[PDB]
Nucleic acid binder design. Structure first.
Ligand SMILES: Nc1ncnc2c1ncn2[C@@H]1O[C@H](COP(=O)(O)OP(=O)(O)OP(=O)(O)O)[C@@H](O)[C@H]1O
Ligand SMILES: Nc1ncnc2c1ncn2[C@@H]1O[C@H](COP(=O)(O)OP(=O)(O)OP(=O)(O)O)[C@@H](O)[C@H]1O
Ligand SMILES: Nc1ncnc2c1ncn2[C@@H]1O[C@H](COP(=O)(O)OP(=O)(O)OP(=O)(O)O)[C@@H](O)[C@H]1O
Ligand SMILES: [Mg+2]
Ligand SMILES: [Mg+2]
Ligand SMILES: [Mg+2]
Lengths: 316, 316, 316
DNA sequence: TTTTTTTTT
DNA sequence: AAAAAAAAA
């Protein structure tokens, strides 16, 4: 995709181009999707440079009203990534859609952190297999990124492990304000390359800790909203899917609607329920088989799939 | 591992270095994994000192995107500690993995407090035996730390008791807010030395008491989450394993899923189920033989091992 | 042991010292083992007084990480109290260990309320006999504290009855919320004196009644946990043993594990099974001889002893 | 917006 | 074989 260098020949001459890049801006799209107010906060582009930069960036491409069908076409390069269990891919429409945020929340031992590895391995398969020719970005917020698992699943999928463990990029976010730093940089590698999905285990494992009590709740939800917006924007201007794992909390309140089943009601509140495009609840079933329920999708209606997490990732 | 003195020659000059250390910060890593907001709460580093400190600490080492394989390598120094029963070490992949939290929960007389002593003794064995060249930190929240047992097990393992009883460090946490104080200090001794595992008998024996009733539940779960995060962080930036013993509660609710077996459903809720990387349920079997079931691991799938707690710790 | 007056000369000046004492706090240790939150609920020490009090109390003594061996030494003053039947004292390691909770549960006529008298009398013997130079605290929750029995056993042990019946302190708890009141006060007499063991016949004889039905079960288990924690703490900061008698319930459920022997499964649930350090089951044998089985100890493994309750207490 | 607890006969 | 109740930042 065109970089922030194409407009370098429009008067934007790269004296401050280093300034721009340092700010994270690497593509042209990211120049259009950045508010002026935020662009005049990078210490060296005050007012007029930003006006000329925006005039240029708009001269490259236009954002008006593509009627509806040029959209349906531009919407054809979605690369629905397979999850590994035919039933689930069928209930989701083929798998994890790209240029969108897909969230998975359930109590422990539901393998919602194993679906991450299954995707990490099943994204490097030819398009006619479910994924395709894509690297992966992985942001771990609770550890548990065992590459041994990646190699096991690769071998089980008839694929050179060494190869796959090379197309993955790993980053161990340490605290919330570092997790948010990471996405900015991530805006770079996605500028030139083939990244299909970004993965965030426990999107809120950190925020749950850096902000404790309803004394600092609002300041947490606001940071979380900014973080989720940055993601949803990346996943959109790079045709990249986003996969977030979430957690569950128990409601010590009433015994209605209905009487039981506490392993629900994810954490994050509404700021995260809205931002997520697809929601999925993973529940424990019988023996070693779990139930995946769809709860919020714009394409599908609803259903319940059953899947067993075996030795080749998520299957049945 | 490098201390917080290496950057002392970067402008951080140690005028306030005592301030920093008093705050618990002893290594450089701990400087990177501490949010600014929390660092400007130590009464003497307001804004700019923290900025320069972070610039320095980042100048020493980088945290970007190690692709995947440098990870698989850096992940090679795991020191899987043996538990003492070949079958169990085989079901866990070799034993208690380091840089991770392993939880063990079951009803009384399951010796989940005896596995602690068995580890305390079996951590000081050459790596080719299961542990290796490591001291031990022990935080007792219910008493029952009989060093006599440590000496008995040592003698049974052909090892100088006096020696082992010297490489152990003991602390009797008195109340929750003291148990949480202890880990901060513990951040110090782990700065320079050879500590392999930290042990916490009844991670929640105290929290269960300092906060009674669902009137103060949330305020308990939040403190517990902070405490568990601090641990998981220590165990990660020091290549040290963490071993927590938990307790069991009975569900006076329905008679489904299935009809019986009440000695399950540990306490702590979900805040502790997520934070734990490995879960293990210890159940009473026949005669003097117990059954260890694995329930949540990122490496293994699942299995049931059988072990007898004899006079040399946990064996068969 | 040092009182709460030693720190009186640290700024804590005794203006509110009466406030502190009224709260039960009499020693310094009890000041360290009391959470701040609970200390700012005594109506006259809000925030700063508690901070200075804790600073002082910590200035007297330190609680860090005594490595392991200073522990094995400080653990040398255990005063294992003899029970009266050589076989039982041998199966327990010498008798009832101090600074620990020992529970005894069995069906009626097992004399689990006679072992209480036997201890009451066999605690005032020179250390080389099994007990030693200790008064006794007795909390009766079902009556049946016949001092005549105490005098009979004393005479049988070659000891001045009048003397022993003076070193005993008796309290007839009337209801649960009074039984819990009693331990607080008890925290006083143990401040200055020689008390070796505390005794509680039917630790749950009252709780079984003040809270009926699973509608108020949780509120009963929580109070019981608080009560047991207070005990375990007293028994620890005063080198005093605790001896609890329990009761038995019958399981109208299945006929497995194995088919019979209903006189087991004590009451109290798990909140009491964990808190107890040593468990013992008293069963009826042949003629006038009972069988004592050990079930949960941190020192011993396991065994079955046989003892006959004769006219000199518990013997064979 | 956050946060589960507790066997009896 | 069949039994519920518990708040507070
Ligand atoms: N190769 C394997 N290694 C480890 N576990 C496996 C393997 N194959 C299957 N499993 C099983 O699959 C399940 C995986 O759980 P999973 O990783 O989804 O937990 P999680 O929900 O991601 O973690 P948490 O909920 O604690 O964040 C476990 O029950 C595990 O035992
Ligand atoms: N040397 C020994 N000393 C004491 N008990 C032993 C010994 N060897 C084996 N045992 C037995 O092993 C078991 C140990 O129980 P364990 O210490 O695991 O209880 P726990 O579950 O840790 O304690 P709790 O559940 O009360 O927190 C007991 O049944 C005990 O009798
Ligand atoms: N001097 C004595 N006076 C009374 N009974 C005695 C005496 N000596 C021996 N016994 C016998 O020893 C046994 C004592 O029973 P014990 O006092 O242990 O009952 P308990 O289990 O404590 O009470 P409960 O189970 O009702 O709470 C009885 O069988 C009793 O007849
Ligand atoms: Mg997980
Ligand atoms: Mg124990
Ligand atoms: Mg009795």
């Amino acid at each position: 995709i065109l970089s922030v260098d194409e407009l370098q020949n429009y008067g934007i001459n790269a004296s401050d181009l280093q300034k721009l890049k340092s700010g994270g801006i690497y593509t042209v799209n990211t120049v259009l999707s950045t508010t002026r107010r935020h662009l005049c906060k990078i210490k060296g582009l005050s007012e007029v440079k930003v006006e000329k930069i925006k005039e240029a960036a708009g001269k490259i491409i236009q954002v008006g009203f593509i009627p509806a069908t040029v959209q349906l076409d531009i919407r054809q390069r979605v690369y629905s990534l397979s999850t590994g269990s035919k039933q689930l891919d069928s209930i989701l429409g083929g798998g994890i859609m790209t240029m969108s945020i897909t969230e998975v929340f359930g109590e422990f031992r539901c393998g919602k952190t194993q679906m991450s590895h299954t995707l990490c391995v099943t994204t490097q398969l030819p398009r006619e297999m479910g994924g395709g020719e894509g690297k992966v970005a992985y942001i771990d917020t609770e550890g548990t990124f065992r590459p041994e698992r990646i190699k096991q699943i690769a071998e089980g999928y008839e694929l050179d492990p060494e190869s796959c463990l090379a197309n993955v990029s790993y980053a161990r976010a340490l605290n919330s304000e570092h997790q948010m730093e990471l996405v900015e940089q991530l805006g770079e590698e996605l500028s030139s390359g083939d990244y299909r999905l970004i993965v965030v285990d426990s999107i809120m494992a950190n925020f749950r800790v850096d902000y404790c009590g309803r004394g600092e709740l609002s300041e947490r939800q606001q940071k979380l909203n900014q973080h989720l917006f940055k993601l949803n924007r990346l996943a959109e201007e790079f045709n990249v899917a986003v996969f977030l794992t979430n957690q569950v909390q128990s409601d010590p309140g009433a015994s209605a609607l209905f009487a039981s089943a506490d392993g629900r009601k994810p954490i994050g509140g509404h700021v995260l329920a809205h931002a997520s495009a697809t929601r999925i609840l993973l529940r424990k079933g019988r023996g070693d088989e779990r139930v995946a329920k769809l709860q919020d999708s714009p394409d599908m209606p609803e259903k319940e799939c059953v899947y067993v997490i075996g030795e080749k990732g998520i299957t049945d």
